Design a protein around this ligand. Sequence first.
Ligand code: NI
Length: 341
Amino acid sequence: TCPFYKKIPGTGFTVDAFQYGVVEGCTAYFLTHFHSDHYAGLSKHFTFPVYCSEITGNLLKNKLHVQEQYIHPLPLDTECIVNGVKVVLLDANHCPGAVMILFYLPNGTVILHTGDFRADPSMERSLLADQKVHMLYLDTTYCSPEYTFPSQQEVIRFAINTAFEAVTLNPHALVVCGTYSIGKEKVFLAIADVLGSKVGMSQEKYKTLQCLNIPEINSLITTDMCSSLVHLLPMMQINFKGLQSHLKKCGGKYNQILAFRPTGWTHSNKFTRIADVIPQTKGNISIYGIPYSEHSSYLEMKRFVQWLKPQKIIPTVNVGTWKSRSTMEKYFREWKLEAGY
Ligand code: NI
């Protein structure tokens, strides 16, 4: 059944709740972003109102074929009324089109649902600064102190410097980048920019990127693989067998592959700096796992919550085990006692 952490009290609303059939009492279904664990269940047969960003609504129309009449896109940073309730969508610093949602309940309670987010100090100057938030529905993906990772900027600097050096030493090297969802487009776009290439990809993935309102996108991507020396492949193909096979397909244009897997966290983060990352190599193929995150680190999450000072926190991630739920509740109490709210 629909879990309680997907329901907004005092409303008929649900968030990211499309796989339970008709949720009894739901008048509006919000979708925070276009990732499959969140949209699971939507299709051309859905006939209830879906509220979302403009970019998420482009993907629902073009990739899932949801009918236009049920897609209700809202502008960001704008007070809107939905079924009698004031709401605001805020940028979540996750993937393209991802939002956080502020609900202003008729009784005076204010609720923030973060969706999936990577907390940032810039959020402390949005419309969130303007009133008190009583309840926080929080993306707790990396809510443990072992989860450190570098800034997105540091990781892209590493990637650009590594690719540029490799291709300048060997003009016959191909760069490959893995993907299995939207998000992390900076990785492949920044590498193609330094190399003076467009990124080549499948027709399905090009269609997906043409929904994202990225500026000058027609100048950066292509379905012509032959004209490109940065290829995007399914994350599943980023291994020695898959990459050897791909290299055969390129008809002797290339004699070396340098590949990137933009993982979330990996336990080499506890020991190793970004400066010191090394690849796995077999023959003329090298694979780099780079810690490019679109979720909060522990410290980023802690700073946001100690700034916001909510009265009640409802985790939305890692809620399936008692040991995880108890650990998270212990951190929330520490943060509150340290900061004095
Ligand atoms: Ni997500």
